[PDB]
Design a protein around this ligand. Structure first.
Ligand code: SF4
Ligand code: SF4
Ligand code: SF4
Lengths: 127, 384, 353, 166, 180, 196
């Protein structure tokens, strides 16, 4: 599993993911948006885990309106996922204290946890 | 035509997905697809106190919920050696037969509406509303009531319950006789249901169709007689039966069951004498709430019981019961902790569904809905 | 139109527009009345809300119907999807003007009816075919074979019983000798209430019109609880409302035609008031039909086809042959009164076993 | 045209829609049966304008999610919602629908607002039929523009008017 | 069985002429039984002191984990509860709450007791997490009801009537059977 | 009467017989003898096959032979042709790295959906099954939920101002392998049983 970007750097994370994704087809990939506080999205932060099935890609909690330009970064990100043909979007709810260590767990544990906790979501709520 | 009757559409009650392989107006074979209601009780319960689980038992079969409550309570009582008071036992059988009547009402209303006419749903639901008023009177809840306890029941009955129960027991015989008068002499329902629903007892046994649609095919097996648990051994009991299992015989058997249940309720109410309501063993039952201001032992036990709970012995246990949908039971593995090691539920609505492709095999397309409604499925029980 | 005058064309147009908007208000408030009558049948009560009597709730419903995002489904025929509702609605609307609501001039000077064509029942038969037309056509245009199959069930059943309608309607023509509704009505004025002579034809016409979506095939089908019906399940804002509107107008047109044709179209033996008796018979048949709607089951349309095909239509042609023998030999007209009375006694005594 | 751009016309059409609210039930669990009780002959949602009940999704404005929404049912309900006419509202009935409820596990969606734009929430297990009527009057007066939150804000008539569907 | 069609029609006619049965909520107040599981209330002693000693037993007994109890030390000058401990923060997520009554059942001081209000439907997830000062016996109504009565100036009318309130609800004022 | 002959037949061939003083009986057959033995059981007149229940003993305080254990429930209907009423369980242990077990679908058509369920929840593969398809867990779900190595997947509960609850750290109740909040658990909280 790869980890790109850095926390609280929305545009750096967005550009790093733009470069790293390339021409990868996301028709069978699963996009996990990791966040806290289900209800309040105005101050929410977001991390991303991209489970392609053959390899996974991690981006730390650097998206969302919680950071300057992070809202537009999340919108562009989800828009690009949809453009690349991603259909399966999920929203994972972790505790604020978890969110940091969860990206420091080993890949298999982190991915099993995310797949267990993820909720099917309308990507439109991030557009 | 491999037609996809989708989940919830069109008006297939108990959300289910069907791949009806079918050419014409027959039914070649229905490929069932379930799992749309899977909540994960068998896993979630491993992380709940035994007392907490009493909130989880009604919510799977939400029509006949007190059967779940009773099966689970009895299994835990066997496992940890509890003593049930006789009045608590009588109350438990009354509530179980009452929720049975409510479930039977909802089943027959849903079937008649599913194929047939809309009108007879409302009378059954009026009697169900009287039953739900009884349930509110006693437990403060319509269903999912948290009343049963491992020792017994949560608390005693108010004064007003018995008069209203007698009122309903007096009105019900005429009501059930009215439903029978409408249905049994079926004008169109006869030519709709008599033939359909092929239920050979051998195939019912091979596929394990135990759930109350088996006796409509002429098999005399009721748990309340074969393996008496809650004192039904001490009741004058008629077990209705059917000649050849069809929708007609299924429905009429269930109506006679409702009248017999009313007679059982009358009998139990007659044999009712005051007494205590739950096993006073403090390891099992929280201390009385009045002396929580006097005894250190009371306070400690209250605190410990309501936080940690209690620890049953290491062992596996199972008890069978008869609900309005057949054989029900809990296989409980306890590891000596305050939360059960594992709880598996035998789902009668789940085992009964293996006989659906066979039952509706060769039947009509409109009748594929009636034959499903007549089998009385509950997807909260099936998917679970 | 042997004895009846003709209003000017502008007056005919005015009367036509009046009958159309009256059928609008009629089906809307009859939906209210059926809701509340079903509610009375099943001990609940109806909408004492947005009314008082609920009589502003159809307004709220129409206001919802418009603005409701009339959607044109992709993969459906762009033209036919839009076109089919108009057909089903127009050919249900028309063929109500023929019904005489009074003696000539009792429309405050001019004409109780709109048109009094010399050949009436043929007009009714033709326009009855066109309802099944619209049904299965919308079933196709929906571009969903699920709906198409119901449309085909519909078409099969409705076509069967629509054929039966002709052999039902044959008998009174032999007696009256005219195909004009007013002439038939006046024949019922003189000899009296043609159903007294033709009770079997009355029954088979009733049961045939029941198949025209009235109820108890009830595998018409509606999308609910079966292999879905046709002509719906793909229309959202206005076209679905139009389909239901036409089905109800056909319902009430049949409920009006039954007394108009077989019973005493208005032309009462006593008090001879133009409109009120016709409307009262309409209401009577409507209430009986709603009783049926509530009180009787489905037929699976296989039993319905079997029943209509094997029982209703042969019975209707047998009665037509008997009446044709009687009229050709002309012996009395009393023999038909006796025969219909005895047939009713027979078809009744077989029930109470 | 969405019922907008005239002071009288929009209030009139909102009146009409509010009273003509057409429920489409999406029954999942026992919340569905407690909603079926909101139609019987003791307490009927058959007065305010909800008498008729068209199983088709092309024919109703109100989508009432009644029961626990399993993750396997989420895309189905998603597409049933997307296959609705556009002036459409979403009610979330019961604890399992509103939040994860007492079933906090891999199987159940922890907020139906994840998949469908929810208009009204109604707690309870099950929520009483009269609480559901309170919710529909709540939605009624919401589409009337008579609804405010605890923060003082007026709520838009239609949620799912604010989302980039795709 | 041709007779059955006629008998069915007849009984449906009888029940047609049977008019009454229904209750028109909100125009008629719903009759609730005394043990009904409604809006949580925190009860006070005759002294006016709150009963809640902030013992988190209602949260520990919670199967949905919907109760958050932050405790604090009673101030002798102006006390809140009867012991040295009271409820500084008492929140219950009604959307997580499954309405057992186990919180009351674990309540040793009888502070938390289920009420009778059911008209608690609201628009926002974050508004359905009820706080202490939304549940005290002194309050009359639910959150949307009170918000409507404030943005309306029209007092709160509850849509329920009961024969009487339970003793555990001491202080809880409700319309009782016609006593008023 | 048929149960007595089952006990006599199992004891003679060295099959362990587990019994609790509550009235429940098991007959544990080895993997080899499982299929043929239960075929013989059906031949003995066991009409009805009630349940197929899979068990993951990974987190059990006492060890067991293998991680997984499958338990079948066989019955003979009392009201049928010649009904004794004898019902009993057959337990069969299954290795972690060999999740194989022959089906009895050919014997009872009841085992069909039950064995599909056991395969869904545990990685237990049933040999000879007509269709082993995932029944309950979502089509795209990865793994087998009910084996203890699979997380329950809880979501935190939410309150007003940063106040949240994590159930796995909020739970006061203890499991069998949980030591407790004191230095140890003894007595009742290491297991308790009343003497009726
Ligand atoms: S909130 Fe309660 S009543 Fe509703 S679906 Fe969940 S368990 Fe059933
Ligand atoms: S009634 Fe609500 S707050 Fe109380 S224990 Fe149950 S879920 Fe928790
Ligand atoms: S159990 Fe009672 S006294 Fe204890 S914290 Fe809860 S409400 Fe307060």
């Amino acid at each position: 599993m790869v980890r790109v970007g850095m926390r609280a750097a929305p545009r750096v994370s967005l550009e790093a993911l733009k470069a790293a994704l390339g021409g990868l087809k996301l028709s069978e990939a699963k996009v996990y948006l990791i966040t806290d506080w289900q209800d309040k999205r105005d101050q929410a932060r977001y991390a991303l885990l991209l489970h392609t099935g053959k390899k996974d890609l991690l981006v730390p909690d650097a998206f969302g309106p919680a950071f300057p330009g992070g809202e537009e970064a999340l919108s562009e990100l989800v828009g690009l996922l949809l453009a690349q043909g991603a259909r399966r979007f999920y929203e994972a709810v972790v505790s604020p204290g978890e969110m940091t260590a969860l990206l420091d767990l080993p890949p298999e544990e982190l991915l099993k946890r995310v797949m267990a906790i993820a909720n099917p979501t309308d990507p439109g709520i991030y557009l | 035509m491999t037609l996809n009757v989708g989940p919830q559409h069109p008006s297939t009650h108990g959300v289910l997905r069907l791949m009806v392989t079918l050419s014409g107006e027959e039914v070649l074979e229905v490929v069932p697809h379930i799992g749309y209601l899977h909540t994960g009780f068998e896993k979630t319960m491993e992380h709940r106190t035994y007392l907490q689980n009493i909130t989880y038992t009604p919510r799977m079969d939400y029509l006949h919920s007190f059967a779940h409550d009773l099966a689970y309570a009895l299994a835990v009582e066997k496992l940890l050696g509890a003593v049930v008071p006789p009045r608590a036992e009588t109350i438990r059988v009354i509530l179980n037969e009452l929720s049975r009547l409510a479930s039977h009402l909802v089943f027959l209303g849903t079937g008649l509406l599913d194929l047939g006419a809309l009108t007879p749903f409302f009378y059954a639901f009026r009697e169900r509303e009287t039953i739900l008023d009884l349930f509110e009177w006693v437990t403060g809840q319509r269903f999912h009531h948290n009343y049963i306890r491992i020792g017994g029941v949560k608390e005693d009955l108010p004064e007003e319950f018995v008069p209203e129960l007698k009122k309903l027991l007096e009105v019900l015989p005429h009501r059930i006789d009215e439903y029978e008068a409408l249905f049994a002499e079926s004008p169109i329902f006869y030519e709709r249901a008599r033939g359909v629903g092929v239920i050979p007892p051998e195939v019912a046994i091979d596929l394990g169709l135990t759930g109350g649609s088996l006796r409509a095919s002429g098999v005399n097996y009721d748990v309340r007689k074969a393996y008496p648990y809650s004192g039904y051994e001490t009741y004058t009991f008629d077990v209705p039966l059917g000649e050849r299992g069809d929708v007609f015989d299924r429905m009429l058997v269930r109506i006679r069951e409702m009248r017999e249940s009313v007679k059982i309720i009358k009998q139990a109410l007659e044999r009712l004498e005051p007494g205590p309501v739950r096993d006073p063993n403090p390891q099992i039952t929280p201390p009385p709430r009045h002396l929580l201001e006097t005894s250190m032992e009371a306070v400690i036990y209250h605190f410990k019981h309501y936080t940690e709970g209690f620890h049953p012995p290491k062992g596996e246990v199972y008890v069978p019961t008869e609900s309005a949908r057949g054989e029900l039971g809990y296989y409980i593995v306890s590891d000596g902790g305050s939360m059960p090691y594992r709880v598996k539920v035998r789902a009668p609505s789940f085992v009964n569904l293996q006989s659906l492709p066979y039952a509706c095999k060769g039947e009509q397309v409109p009748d594929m809905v009636a034959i499903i409604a007549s089998l009385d499925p509950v997807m909260g029980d099936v998917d679970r | 139109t042997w004895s009846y005058p003709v209003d000017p064309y502008w007056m005919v147009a005015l009367k036509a527009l009046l009958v159309v908007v009256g059928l609008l208000t009629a089906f809307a408030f009859m939906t209210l009345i059926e809701r509340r009558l079903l509610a009375r049948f099943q001990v609940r009560m109806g909408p004492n809300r947005v009314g008082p009597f609920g009589l502003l709730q159809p307004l709220a419903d129409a206001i919802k119907s418009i603005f409701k995002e009339d959607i044109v489904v992709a993969q459906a025929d762009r033209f036919l999807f839009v076109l089919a509702p108009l057909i089903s609605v127009v050919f249900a609307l028309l063929a109500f003007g023929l019904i005489p609501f009074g003696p000539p001039g009792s429309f405050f000077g001019y004409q109780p009816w709109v048109i009094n064509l010399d050949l009436g029942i043929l007009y009714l038969f033709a326009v009855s075919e066109l309802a099944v037309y619209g049904i299965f056509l919308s079933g196709w245009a929906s571009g969903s074979k699920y709906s198409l199959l119901g449309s085909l069930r519909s078409s099969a059943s409705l076509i069967s019983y629509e054929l039966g309608l002709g052999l039902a309607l044959l008998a009174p023509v032999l007696l009256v000798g005219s195909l004009n509704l007013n002439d038939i009505v006046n024949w019922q004025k003189e000899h009296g209430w043609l159903f007294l002579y033709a009770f079997p034809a009355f029954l088979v016409y009733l049961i045939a019109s029941m198949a025209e979506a009235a109820r108890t095939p009830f595998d018409l089908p509606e999308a609910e609880q079966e292999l879905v019906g046709g002509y719906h399940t793909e229309y959202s804002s206005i076209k679905w409302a139009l389909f239901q509107m036409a089905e109800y107008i056909h319902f009430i047109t049949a409920s009006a035609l039954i007394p108009t044709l077989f019973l005493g179209g208005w032309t009462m033996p006593v008090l001879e008031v133009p409109y009120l008796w016709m409307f009262l018979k309409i209401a009577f048949f409507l209430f009986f039909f709603i009783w049926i709607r509530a009180t009787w089951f489905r037929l699976r349309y296989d039993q319905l086809l079997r029943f209509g095909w094997g029982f209703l239509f042969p019975l209707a042609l047998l009665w037509f042959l008997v009446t044709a023998l009687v009229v050709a030999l002309d012996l009395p007209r009393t023999y038909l009164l006796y025969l219909s009375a005895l047939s009713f006694l027979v078809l009744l005594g077989a029930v109470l076993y | 045209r969405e019922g907008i751009l005239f002071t009288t016309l929009e209030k009139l059409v909102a009146w009409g829609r509010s009273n003509s609210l057409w429920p489409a039930t999406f029954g999942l669990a026992c919340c569905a049966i407690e909603m079926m009780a909101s139609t019987d002959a003791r307490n009927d949602l058959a007065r305010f304008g909800s008498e008729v009940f068209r199983a088709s999704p092309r024919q109703a404005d109100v989508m009432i999610v009644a029961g626990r929404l399993s993750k396997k049912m989420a895309p189905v309900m998603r597409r049933v919602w997307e296959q609705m006419p556009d002036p459409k509202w979403v009610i979330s009935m019961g604890a399992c629908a509103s939040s994860g409820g007492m079933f906090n596990n891999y199987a159940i969606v922890q907020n139906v607002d994840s998949v469908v734009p929810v208009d009204v929430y109604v707690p309870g297990c099950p929520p009483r039929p009269e609480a559901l009527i309170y919710a529909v009057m709540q939605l009624q007066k919401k589409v009337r523009g008579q609804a405010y939150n605890e923060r003082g804000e007026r709520l838009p008539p239609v949620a799912a008017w604010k989302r980039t569907r795709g | 069985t041709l007779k059955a069609l006629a008998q069915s029609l007849g009984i449906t006619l009888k029940y047609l002429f049977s008019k009454p049965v229904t209750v028109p909520y909100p125009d008629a107040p719903v009759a609730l039984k005394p043990r009904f599981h409604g809006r949580h209330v925190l009860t006070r002693h005759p002294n006016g002191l709150e009963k809640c000693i902030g013992c988190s037993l209602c949260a520990a007994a919670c199967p949905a984990y919907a109760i958050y109890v932050e405790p604090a030390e009673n101030d002798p000058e102006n006390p809140v509860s009867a012991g040295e401990r009271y409820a500084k923060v008492y929140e219950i997520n009604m959307l997580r709450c499954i309405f057992c009554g186990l919180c009351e059942e674990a309540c040793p001081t009888g502070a938390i007791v289920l009420g009778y209000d059911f008209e608690m439907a609201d628009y926002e997830y974050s508004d359905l997490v009820y706080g202490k000062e939304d549940m005290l016996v002194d309050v009359v109504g639910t959150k949307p009801q009170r918000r409507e009565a404030k943005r309306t100036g029209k007092p709160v009318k509850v849509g329920y009537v009961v024969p009487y309130v339970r003793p555990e609800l001491e202080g809880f004022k409700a319309p009782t059977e016609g006593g008023k | 009467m048929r149960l007595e002959r089952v006990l006599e037949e199992a004891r003679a061939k060295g099959y362990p017989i587990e019994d609790n003083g509550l009235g429940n009986l098991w007959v544990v057959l080895p993997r080899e003898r499982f299929k043929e033995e239960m075929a013989h059981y059906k031949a003995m007149g066991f009409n009805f096959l009630a349940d197929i229940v899979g068990l993951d003993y990974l987190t059990y305080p006492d060890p067991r032979p293998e991680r997984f254990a499958v338990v079948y429930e066989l019955v003979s209907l009392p009201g049928w042709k010649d009904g004794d009423g004898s019902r009993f369980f057959v337990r069969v242990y299954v290795p972690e790295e060999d999740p194989r077990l022959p089906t009895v679908t050919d014997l009872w058509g009841s085992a069909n959906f039950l064995e599909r369920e056991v395969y869904d929840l545990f990685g237990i593969v049933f040999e000879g099954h007509p269709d082993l398809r995932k029944i309950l867990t979502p089509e795209d779900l990865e793994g087998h939920p009910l084996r203890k190595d699979y997380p329950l997947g809880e979501t935190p509960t939410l309150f007003r101002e940063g106040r949240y609850i994590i159930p796995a750290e909020f739970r006061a109740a203890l499991t069998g392998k949980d030591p407790g909040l004191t230095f140890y658990k003894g007595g009742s909280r290491k297991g308790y049983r009343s003497l009726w």
